[PDB]
Amino acid sequence: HVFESNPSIRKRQQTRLLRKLRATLDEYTTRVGQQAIVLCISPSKPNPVFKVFGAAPLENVVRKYKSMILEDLESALASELPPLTIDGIPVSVDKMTQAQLRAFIPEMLKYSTGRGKPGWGKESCKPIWWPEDIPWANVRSDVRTEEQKQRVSWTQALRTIVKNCYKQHGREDLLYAF
Amino acid sequence: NSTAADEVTAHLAAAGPVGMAAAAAVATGKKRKRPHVFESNPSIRKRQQTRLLRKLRATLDEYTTRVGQQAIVLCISPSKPNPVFKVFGAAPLENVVRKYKSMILEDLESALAENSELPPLTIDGIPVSVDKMTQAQLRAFIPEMLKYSTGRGKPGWGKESCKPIWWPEDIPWANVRSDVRTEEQKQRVSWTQALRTIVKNCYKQHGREDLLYAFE
DNA sequence: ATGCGCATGCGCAT
DNA sequence: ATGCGCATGCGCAT
């Protein structure tokens, strides 16, 4: 998507998306039975909008933090690939489990190639950085030769897939968490 | 916020602070007359949580891009020892909010403060039926259930002097870490069913079979 | 001695 | 066509 430069269209979209956020969140909080809120902010003068909606009592709890969150936010304000984080927490590539790597790699691929679907098994879709000793095949199930498995554990091969991608894009800053 | 006035939210609210958080969340929606209802099956509920978080992330992304405005979703489960506190959305608001995990958790817990030898069956504080637990959850639960049932810190796996009186006759008295049944035993009863039988037998023996079937 | 949690396959909804 | 998440062994810290 793109920022909507026309304000009339921007207010139309805001209304549509905010409302869709409310309906999706209401479905989430009821069906999952979990406290969750959406928080939207604009520090525009002279009255910044601090809009919270979702589950009670989380909604009123978060509202009490308007002044502090607004303060802290003005302040933070003072080749793309995902950061090495699983659920908002940073992980070393060497810290990720096989299960974390199997989930991380298809997301990484989307960023690296631009494709929503990787096209496993089609050589025309294989990235240039794909490791030479790993078949271009769904990481769902290791299909390497049995001697390949003796040399390199599957967890280590999966880490190599990730390391090759970040280095190919020159994103050591993300891989090593500078 | 009055949660006792519906059976599902009633059972949720009596499970403790995680369940009170859940009951209050479901009750928020009952006030808006919304169509949906809570999902008692933890495998379906996990699947819906995944689908629905994906949709929220995508809508937050579109909103933040098209409207140009910082926006996050925050989800919390006040569990112990590790509470769920996931924030996602626009940066840097995402990281601003993360720094208040401490305060927001204690503030949520405050606002929510408004007879069995055997523990309740819950997944991360949410009541669950024994027939809906996964194999991993049953296998992890059994050694904790043995501590409660026998009072022993160590179960003495394989010591016949430690085998519980309710232990199922067609399962070796052996660490549920690894199924050591014979192949014919394995063909007759799935490992998940055997593990359910271990649990069911224990609760039956203690007279607390009512703790086994949350939400039917 | 014993259970936490990874490894990894693979069912199956997508 | 594709990746979530359950089934179970087992490494290994305790």
Residue numbers in the entry:
A (entry chain B): 95 to 172, 183 to 282
B (entry chain A): 60 to 173, 182 to 283
From the primary publication:
Nuclear respiratory factor 1 (NRF1) regulates the expression of genes that are vital for mitochondrial biogenesis, respiration, and various other cellular processes. NRF1 was initially identified as a transcription activator of cytochrome c by binding to the cytochrome c promoter as a homodimer. Subsequently, a consensus sequence GCGCNTGCGC (N represents any nucleotide) was identified as the DNA binding motif of NRF1 (6), which has also been detected in the promoters of many other nuclear genes relevant to mitochondrial biogenesis and respiration, such as the promoters of reductase (ubiquinone-binding protein) complex (6), cytochrome oxidase assembly factor COX17 (7), myocyte enhancer factor 2A (MEF2A), and ferridoxin reductase (FDXR). Our structural, mutagenesis and luciferase reporter assay results revealed that, although the NRF1 DBD alone is capable of recognizing the TGCGC DNA motif, the cooperativity between DD and DBD is essential for the binding of the intact GCGCATGCGC sequence and the transcriptional activity of NRF1.
To investigate the molecular mechanisms underlying the selective binding of NRF1 to the GCGCATGCGC DNA sequence, we determined the crystal structure of NRF1 (aa 54–284) with a 14pb ATGCGCATGCGCAT dsDNA. In the complex structure, NRF1 forms a homodimer and binds to a single ATGCGCATGCGCAT DNA duplex. The β1 and β2 strands from each monomer form an intermolecular 4-stranded β-sheet, while the α3 and α4 helices from two monomers form antiparallel helices and pack against either side of the β-sheet through extensive hydrophobic interactions. The DBD is composed of three helices α5 to α7 and two short 310-helix, and each DBD possesses positively charged surfaces to recognize two neighboring major grooves of the DNA duplex from nearly opposite side. Interestingly, in the NRF1 dimer-dsDNA complex, although the DD or DBD from the two monomers superimposes very well (with RMSDs of 0.33Å and 0.34Å, respectively), the arrangement of these two domains differs in both monomers. When binds with DNAs, only one NRF1 monomer adopts a structural conformation that is close to the AlphaFold2 predicted model, and the DBD and DD of the other NRF1 monomer adopts a U-turn conformation, resulting in the two DBDs of the NRF1 homodimer bind to the consensus sequence GCGCNTGCGC from nearly the opposite side of the DNA duplex. In the NRF1 dimer-dsDNA complex, two DBDs of the NRF1 dimer bind to the DNA duplex from opposite directions. Hence, residues R206, N242, and R244 of NRF1 DBD are critical in sequence-specific binding to the GCGCATGCGC motif. Remarkably, the helix α3 from the DD of the NRF1 monomer exhibits a positively charged surface and forms electrostatic interaction with the DNA duplex.
